[PDB]
Design a protein around this ligand. Structure first.
Ligand SMILES: Nc1ncnc2c1ncn2[C@@H]1O[C@H](COP(=O)(O)OP(=O)(O)OP(=O)(O)O)[C@@H](O)[C@H]1O
Ligand SMILES: Nc1ncnc2c1ncn2[C@@H]1O[C@H](COP(=O)(O)OP(=O)(O)O)[C@@H](O)[C@H]1O
Lengths: 381, 381
């Protein structure tokens, strides 16, 4: 809401993800071949493909009880867990709804004997939370009184007038127009998301209406599980989390040998099936959580979105020409380096927290991710 | 000259009002605009008498009313089943909410019904030039007066604009909530500003929150009324729209003998008490709708804004010694050129409509106005 969650919970923030390079196939922006190729040509023989759920990114921390939260995290709140977003805010404004979700996850972990097997009284999870409309967003095209765009036009006029006043003085034109663009583009971009996700949204009237799909066991007491491969993650999660309660989802995923023509072809067909109706697509990850070709760090994940979906996001009547394709590949380049830095910051933050370092040291890294996500990037990516 | 901005049936777009020039810079001290200059402009061009209307907080509104949806389709060629429209100088719908627009048109319609306007004009439609103004339902007075009463003005909003300009031009230890503020999306900044602008200027939830002040009966079946003086427009409007429905309000106006020292003193004082109370100022018009002095067309109107109101537009510190430039007078020159050109396009649009020229011939003039409003010019004028 107006405020972040208690900073004591914020031990981690997920990194941005890179798309694949522009496909050479006609009418295609992205295609699995580019994703698999990136890994094949960098020494990775096996990758794991996960189905994109089409919800929102959520970090979920669960403690056995309030006593654990207070002692371990210094949370003086009375809470025994949290489900927070990407900017460190609570996913829900209803703390009761959040607590129910946490309780549901706790019960599942009780029955599966997770605590005992992991020798921990808390867990941090990287998740997707569905449905997409369950989060808060919100709109100037259906105003209550005066039309949104008229009010915008008028407010913009006064902005321009105010510019001519001498307060701060440096001689370049008013970037008010560049600024009105970032605003309308944001709006037109949001309109597109609504259209792409509308089919995958349903009202939530209770916790029963939610779906949580965890894909990472980030950390438990005394260990960050960045040393475990995604198959371990997928199945451990399925074993401890998905058996008892339909609230928690397993993630449809496949293994692909990026050197095997047959395995790759099964991967492509798998992806084609996911995105046939406009599904978002898949995330392609190296078999291992962390891989290094030479000392070059490799993308921990590459997203590969469906034709129908990208059609909506980019606009149906949208064409890519040379130079634009060239610009897209450059931008993909920026996103890559950015993803790596954020990825590492988030890993170090968890590591520092696991080693019981001062909270401000953990926040050095957690906040760094936040700062990096402030930089302007192409939203369609 | 766009239609995504209009959003309405293009058949309604038979007119756009012209921009308006301010008066020559006053020679008085601490004054940028004074009624003397407005009066002088008209005196030295053969206009002996002028009409002064109070300039209210609000926006120029074009309002077209047909008796019913059938007249709309037959006379205007409208296809969406509406029977009237309220739109801005920029050709945009005033409301995102069609029912709200419909209620406003219907109110005006009923008033024309009661007065027997249709019969006395032998028309089933009318095009009105108006101002739309925020109205405090609770206090039963203009929102403007309500603010005025506690020394509140548009400085509130100017301050916001100024915050935005500085915040956009930018880049115990770390506080997460300070960081979230600091990393506020540039798109979010703009959004908060527009919302603050709506809150001050247009806190409107329904028709009870608005007034309409018509000042020109532009056109009715078979006749554009540019041949009738502004006293005729004010009288006729008072007779046919001002008697009943409280939605339609009369515009406070006086009349000045520009060659008479006593009459001028009365008008100056009228303006001073008007502006001293917080008023934006006045609009000075020639007695006739169209005056041409020796093959030269006069400004159809000149605005004269109050000293305190001009601090919002020019900056609070404009008065002290920046007042000496002021050499803007040439700036007022380009503005004056656009005014005449736009004015002529608008009367031509109406004349073509009234003589049943094809829609595109009408639109050629209307879009011409938009195109001229698109030329760079000092926004404070
Ligand atoms: N009695 C009147 N006759 C003519 N114009 C009037 C009158 N009273 C108020 N006005 C307003 O003053 C306007 C132009 O001056 P100003 O620079 O303040 O307005 P603006 O901010 O361009 O936009 P708007 O035209 O939306 O009011 C006219 O468009 C009109 O709404
Ligand atoms: N199986 C999965 N593994 C990893 N990430 C996933 C998976 N399913 C969905 N995602 C989501 O895909 C997102 C990428 O979404 P996107 O809207 O492209 O954001 P960004 O530009 O910040 O990367 C991640 O933030 C994550 O929330």
């Amino acid at each position: 809401s107006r405020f972040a969650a208690d900073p004591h919970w914020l031990i981690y923030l997920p990194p941005t993800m890179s798309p694949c390079e522009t496909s050479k196939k006609e009418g295609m922006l992205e295609h699995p071949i580019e994703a698999f190729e990136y890994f094949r040509t960098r020494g990775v023989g096996k990758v794991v493909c996960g189905q994109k759920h089409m919800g929102s990114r959520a970090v979920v921390i669960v403690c056995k009880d309030s006593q654990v939260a207070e002692k371990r995290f210094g949370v003086l709140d009375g809470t025994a867990g949290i489900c927070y977003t990407r900017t460190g805010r609570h996913f829900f404004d209803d703390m009761q709804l959040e607590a129910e979700l946490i309780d549901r996850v706790r019960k599942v972990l009780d029955k599966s004997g997770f605590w005992g097997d992991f020798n921990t009284d808390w867990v941090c999870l990287d998740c997707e939370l569905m449905p997409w409309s369950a989060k808060a967003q919100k709109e100037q095209y259906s105003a209550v009184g005066i039309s949104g765009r008229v009010v915008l036009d008028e407010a913009v006029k006064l902005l321009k007038q105010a510019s001519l006043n001498k307060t701060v003085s440096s001689g370049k034109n008013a970037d008010i127009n560049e600024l009105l663009q970032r605003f309308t583009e944001r709006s037109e971009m949001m309109q597109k998301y609504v259209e792409a996700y509308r089919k995958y949204c349903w009202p939530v009237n209770s916790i029963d209406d939610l779906k949580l799909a965890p894909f990472h066991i980030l950390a438990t007491e005394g260990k960050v599980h960045s040393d475990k491969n995604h198959i371990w993650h997928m199945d451990t999660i399925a074993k401890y989390c998905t058996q008892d309660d339909s609230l928690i989802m397993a993630t449809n995923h496949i293994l692909v040998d990026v050197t095997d023509a047959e395995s790759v072809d099964k991967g492509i067909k798998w992806w084609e099936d996911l995105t046939a109706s406009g599904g978002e697509g898949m995330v392609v990850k190296p078999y291992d959580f962390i891989v290094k070709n030479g000392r070059e760090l490799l993308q921990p994940a590459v997203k590969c979105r469906g034709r129908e979906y990208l059609r909506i996001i980019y606009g149906p009547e949208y064409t890519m020409d040379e130079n634009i394709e060239r610009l897209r590949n450059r931008a993909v380049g920026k996103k890559r380096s950015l993803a790596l830095r954020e990825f590492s910051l988030g890993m170090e933050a968890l590591e520092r927290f696991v080693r019981n370092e001062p909270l401000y040291r953990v926040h050095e890294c957690v906040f760094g991710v936040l700062a990096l996500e402030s930089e302007p990037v192409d939203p369609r990516l």
